[PDB]
Symmetry: D2
Subunit: 215 residues, 4 copies
């Protein structure tokens, strides 16, 4: 499943993120704000149950209960993902969090890269209950999808109920590379940009997330 959340407000925020004239502080704040929104969006795709509920007026009426809100595990790739994850956590108060610090190797090639090398420097995750937990992996940018793939390479092992991916911008290349390998993934993104350059950056994109957030 591919979800492109292009509502006014998310595009508005995305514009600010794209704007090279946005300082790191506001860059991060916007990233958190988006995380919260994308969380809301994911919420409505979550599996839920119909229930009945009684009101103070002594009458019963039917309602909804997204019990799955207790079966969420957010994976923090770290670095630029932090502010985004922060937003997601605010969205899912009862979510557990694990971290899989992965970093692709920045390299300048002759052609547009198809894959980068990614390494997991730190891993500490909660226990992902197979068939029960909804796992959400966040990463502001998905270029060659190499980073996401490395993380997924082992989130899938746990066989979660669902696996959501959340990013601000994903390249057409990355999106296809991921969904063709794991068609069951719910991929959420604010925008899908057309191309990558020789260094592996999304165009137009918004520059290097890490630098835009901490530089």
């Amino acid at each position: 499943p591919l979800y492109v959340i292009d509502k006014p407000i998310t595009l508005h925020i995305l514009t600010q993120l794209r704007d090279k004239y946005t300082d790191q502080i506001n860059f991060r704040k916007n990233l958190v704000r988006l995380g919260r929104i994308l969380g809301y969006e994911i919420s409505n795709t979550l599996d839920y149950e119909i229930v009945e509920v009684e009101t103070p007026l002594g009458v019963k009426t039917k309602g909804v209960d997204i019990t799955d809100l207790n079966n969420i595990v957010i994976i923090n790739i770290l670095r630029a993902a932090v502010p985004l994850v922060e937003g997601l956590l605010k969205a899912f108060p009862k979510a557990r969090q694990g971290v899989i610090g992965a970093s692709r190797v920045e390299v300048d090639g002759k052609e547009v890269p198809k894959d980068m090398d990614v390494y997991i420097y730190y891993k500490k995750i909660p226990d992902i209950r197979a068939k029960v937990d909804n796992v959400i992996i966040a990463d502001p940018m998905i270029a060659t999808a190499s980073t996401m793939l490395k993380v997924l390479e082992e989130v899938v092992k746990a066989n979660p109920k669902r696996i959501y991916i959340v990013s601000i911008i994903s390249s057409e290349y990355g999106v296809n590379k991921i969904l063709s390998k794991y068609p069951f993934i719910y991929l959420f993104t604010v925008a899908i940009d057309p191309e990558l350059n020789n260094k592996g950056y999304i165009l137009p994109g918004l520059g290097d997330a890490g630098d835009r957030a901490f530089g």
Copy 2:
């Protein structure tokens, strides 16, 4: 314009609010959470302009800018509205806030009320720039719409660019009474309940907002 935000997450929260077994603390927390969501929702209906922006990659791309995010005035009816307004404020960081403390007189009549008598005990509002400001009036419950009408009775005077009304539950009666008197209002609500009782309470509803929040 009538907007009934019945997405899973808002219904989920509404269910918790309806549930007579929800303590005041969680009642309020849920009210704030909804406020933020409804804010997000309103955001996407806001008037916006298309712009262009240059990304760090030295390329220009078009984007959105909801400049109107600077022309928002939230009116706090006070009492139960507080938690809801709190949520709205978190949604509109740059919003100004005024307060019009209005309270209908709780009375027990023979038939289902069509109007209650509301009085403004405190009024202090910013400068509502005609044709420019988007005014948002919040009230968890709209039963006879008498309360909303009293407030509107003078928000309209300022002739804002737009006037949004936000509630958790509104009675079919209230919604009709408001939109037929001010067809231009953007009325947002999570649910529209069918009837009112002799005391003027929404059925099923969720009881007395004030009591559910501070009792």
Copy 3:
């Protein structure tokens, strides 16, 4: 007990509040920020129990547990108090909240007022468990103390374990009027100003809280 929290940060914020050139938005934001801080401050005066706990290293060590953090009731006077209460609530996550909407009558007299007439327009409070609950009443300004006294006039009825009063600025007159009538009250304030004018305003003070927040 009188507590004047005059640490750099609280004075810094108080300065912003005093400055007449501070818009309502930042006025309110600062009020919330102070509420948090004052909450923290009150926390450390709270009654607590020494306990023992076992760390992951399989060793036991003594610790503290402010169980009273579950026995807090914050009373919202409404209007300008809202932002301050918001800050307090963020400080006491598990606090219940009641509201006693009281408003003194603004009048211009020949001399400096010694009392104003305050009326309770709305009252809805949780159950204040005598000898157990720590009640916190917030009001940004305490001039003739007439407002605080009216509220206390019945918070005392419930015979709480403790009663804390929180304000940004209190007049020397008010502070003495309160603590001499209820010596057991824990009165917290960022600053105590010297005099009141003929209309009953604190000098230097910071103007009318309501107007500075919603005007």
Copy 4:
């Protein structure tokens, strides 16, 4: 300068952190809450200036202005530091943030370690304006101080106005190793534990921060 913030509330939170029976969610939440508090505490040690301002009552009074609140750079060591940094950021709204991902090598030795080997896997920091910026480095635990030292090894290069270190628990050994090498550092901690074990863990301590937060 050594600052041991042992007020009721910080000890209360520290107790929860120490308790091995605290799940990762509440572990993290407490870490953020402390970050805020410790931020508040640091705030009051900040350099400030005395100013004057005119209140709405047309009178001038002196006030404080901690201008340095604009000259703060928080360094995120990543991993367990994240929640702590999150708290600090909430305390310093205008703070810039850089990250120096450093990780000591966990090893089991015969005796109590005196140093571990730490490596910097990722570094991206803002402009640390010499003599002007107040740098705050956060790390929940300081055992052999090897991690802090590695980070400081190059924060010092920038010659900031001040350098604050923030941790929940620091070993007597670490505290001594740091302050004797950089006597000018403002070291803030909630508690100083007596010893380390053969693996380099603080006793009593609270276990492995990373595991307590993401395990």
